[PDB]
Design a protein around this ligand. Structure first.
Ligand code: 3DS
Ligand code: 3DS
Ligand code: CL
Lengths: 245, 247
């Protein structure tokens, strides 16, 4: 398990993560305020939708604003690489800044960033008591089950506290491939919780069936989804609770 | 896209249909259960006639079928004698079991009958023709309570049920592992997409397989079982999830 704040990830029913996507500090504040009564467990700040992402002061300022409004839930800092492109150097310093701010409980680092940069950045996070979700995505297709499994193992190998993979199905069988890889990884290789999802409405069951197949957290939407296939946070909590009985 | 209409219900379209089973031993029990279930939100009422103690008394079976139809006037009634080989409550010879089903058809009180896959091909074909003549639909079923056959073996069974005339091929299998639940889902998708010219009903049993009861709209199973109430998923919870997944 992985305990963030007072949240234990990888035990009981899967935990719910919602994404905050504001462009400006005004949007970030109004979204955070609106999310405050929503029923979720971890708040993900999707900094890649933040217009002033290349200004350090602005990012720090926006993280504080979120933290001031959402005071109990764990905060996850995520720059998902697609609108404003960044260089590897920019991406790493951004995450380092986040870690050193004290305003975030977890960071997301992409698997295909670079081994040394990743291990370096992972080390820095842990010494600052910040958890690392190491992630990989494919928004166009689903890799073979054994490849999905290889990527999750590589993330464990790099020090991830929570390996994460999100893939896009093109067939219903592709949703089953994602689940097959989840089962295989969790049962045979995982020594930490993992997060897996097959995107789109076709893959929704992968957002619901985490307790049996092995994914420890799942994303839901408050009003706008952060990825296709996310159902409302309320609907998600409803289904996880039924499945936990 | 492949559907079967039973009474006014279209099976195979929209959200999967919820089946509840009546398991009472006596006419009194049957009536009580039917009245209790009318207070629940299901689609199809299955009468598990193997539980009915007076099953070998034709008049008793006809009386009970009439009583149920008085209470549950809207919903389709499926007549199902689960054989003792399948861990039903009582033994009937093959001839008795065919006769029991022919009598359910002849009664005019049931909308569907269940016939087991390995009953006897020639008698199944005759019975299916008889049922069709009376506008009674046939669910053909097979259960593996011990294990999950390979996907292609599950597909093979479903295909044979269509070949025999089934309106709705139905299979239930027991997972021993988590991958087994996915094998049943794989067989459901392969059947629906490549070979089905009928709606199918598939299920992975036990707690571990409950996702197979929820995900039929995507994967291809036209109906699911719940309980009106410790044990399998409730009709209320099943409806809650099916509704969400239909949105
Ligand atoms: O195929 C069946 O009649 C059933 C199989 C099961 O595993 C039961 O939970 C279900 O209510 C009825
Ligand atoms: C990770 C995965 C997402 C999903 O597929 O729900 C949403 C995205 O914001 C997260 O980074
Ligand atoms: Cl059989």
């Amino acid at each position: 398990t992985v305990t963030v704040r007072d949240l234990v990830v990888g035990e009981g029913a899967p935990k719910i993560i919602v994404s905050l996507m504001g462009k400006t500090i005004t949007d970030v504040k109004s979204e955070a305020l609106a999310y405050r009564e929503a029923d979720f467990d971890i708040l993900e700040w999707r900094v890649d939708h933040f217009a002033n992402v290349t200004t350090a002061e602005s990012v720090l300022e926006a993280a504080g604003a979120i933290r001031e409004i959402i005071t109990d839930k764990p905060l996850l800092f995520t720059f998902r690489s697609a609108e404003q492109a960044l260089t590897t150097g920019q991406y790493i310093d951004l995450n380092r800044a986040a870690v050193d701010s004290g305003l975030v409980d977890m960071i997301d680092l992409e698997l295909f960033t670079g081994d040394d940069e990743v291990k370096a950045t992972v080390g820095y996070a842990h010494q600052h008591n910040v958890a690392v979700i190491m992630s990989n995505h494919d928004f166009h297709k689903t890799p073979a089950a054994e490849e999905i499994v290889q990527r999750l193992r590589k993330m464990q190998e790099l020090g991830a506290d929570i390996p994460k993979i999100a893939v896009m199905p093109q067939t219903k069988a592709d949703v089953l491939t994602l689940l097959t890889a989840t089962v295989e990884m969790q049962e045979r290789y995982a020594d930490r919780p993992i997060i897996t999802m097959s995107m789109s409405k076709t893959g929704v069951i992968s957002r619901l069936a985490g307790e049996v197949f092995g994914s420890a957290a799942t994303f839901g939407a408050v009003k706008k989804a952060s990825a296709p296939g996310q159902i409302s946070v309320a609907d998600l909590r409803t289904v996880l609770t039924i499945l936990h009985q």
